[PDB]
């Protein structure tokens, strides 16, 4: 899309990006909570840093989910620019509609950005949101992204889980 993204920022600069997994030497420890009625997702192709899925979905083939990704950025990386370009990805979604570009936030004591809204996929309105947390540590900038997605009618399920995540997550570099 026409919006500059974090991926564009990485591509256009002398920045190395490497995926991070639980237990990797040199990486932060991120304790995400598992809200009630949600179940933990292990690390997989579809949940690179794990995630959570709602255990009482209206459509078991399309349940509300919050998936985590953790990346390690080294080189000519400015943590403030990661936050600056965080809204680009969602804003490029087909028919995305949200309240502006989102807002600043914090998670586990680190600076973050969150935006949410709706988009249309296969003729169905979906609620989507992304929280990006910048974690400068150990000669690198780690970037955590939490990607929430659900059918429009299950928007409140996502919002409830988000409050639990916002209040209980700890991040220790
Ligand atoms: C921690 C994991 C990630 C974070 C937790 C996940 C929480 C997700 C909650 C996200 C709910 C965000 O959606 C809120 C709403 O945004 C848009 O409306 C807003 O923007 C429109 C165009 O500017 C205005 O016309 C509307 O008045 C204004 O409400 C969509 O059109 C709505 O359909 C959607 O409901």
């Amino acid at each position: 899309g026409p919006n500059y993204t974090i991926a564009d920022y990485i591509r256009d600069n002398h920045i190395q990006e490497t995926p991070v997994h639980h237990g990797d030497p040199g990486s932060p420890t991120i304790d995400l909570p598992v809200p009630d009625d949600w179940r933990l997702l292990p690390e997989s192709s579809r949940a690179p840093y794990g995630g959570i899925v709602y255990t009482q979905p209206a459509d078991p083939n399309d349940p509300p989910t919050i998936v985590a990704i953790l990346s390690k950025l080294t080189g000519d990386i400015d943590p403030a620019k990661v936050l600056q370009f965080a809204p680009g990805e969602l804003k490029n979604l087909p028919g995305f509609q949200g309240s502006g570009d989102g807002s600043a936030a914090t998670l586990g004591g680190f600076s973050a950005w969150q935006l949410g809204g709706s988009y249309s996929k296969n003729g169905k309105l979906r609620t989507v949101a992304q929280k990006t947390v910048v974690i400068p540590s150990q000669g690198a900038v780690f970037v955590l992204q939490l990607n929430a997605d659900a059918l429009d009618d299950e928007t409140m399920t996502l919002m409830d889980a988000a409050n639990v995540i916002d209040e209980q997550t700890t991040i220790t570099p």
Side-chain angles (χ1 to χ4, degrees):
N3 301 282
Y4 203 74
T5 66
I6 292 168
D8 296 326
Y9 173 62
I10 293 167
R11 177 194 71 236
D12 292 338
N13 292 278
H14 293 147
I15 298 171
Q16 180 184 258
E17 176 182 27
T18 61
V20 182
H21 303 286
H22 283 82
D24 279 358
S27 70
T29 306
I30 298 165
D31 180 60
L32 269 342
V34 179
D36 291 329
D37 296 334
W38 293 69
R39 82 158 202 262
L40 192 54
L41 291 178
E43 291 192 354
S44 66
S45 294
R46 294 206 165 84
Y49 201 70
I52 53 174
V53 59
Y54 189 59
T55 65
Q56 287 157 3
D59 182 359
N61 281 265
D62 195 0
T65 63
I66 302 177
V67 164
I69 306 152
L70 186 60
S71 306
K72 180 181 185 180
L73 305 184
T74 54
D76 191 18
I77 179 73
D78 179 354
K81 297 298 277 189
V82 176
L83 296 162
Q84 184 174 353
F85 301 133
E89 181 180 357
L90 295 214
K91 290 173 67 184
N92 290 340
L93 243 22
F96 179 79
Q97 51 214 114
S99 295
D101 292 350
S103 66
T106 63
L107 227 227
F110 288 91
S111 298
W113 194 267
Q114 180 164 310
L115 81 163
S118 299
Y119 83 119
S120 292
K121 169 154 176 163
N122 302 322
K124 307 174 188 238
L125 197 62
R126 307 190 66 87
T127 296
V128 65
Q130 183 182 69
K131 191 165 197 170
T132 297
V133 188
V134 177
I135 306 161
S137 174
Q138 298 184 59
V141 176
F142 292 85
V143 181
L144 173 71
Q145 293 195 305
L146 304 176
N147 293 331
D149 165 76
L151 291 163
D152 177 69
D153 197 53
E154 291 168 290
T155 292
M156 188 67 65
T157 308
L158 291 183
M159 303 190 68
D160 290 338
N163 301 319
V164 178
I165 293 170
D166 292 352
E167 88 183 17
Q168 302 186 12
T169 296
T170 70
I171 300 175
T172 310

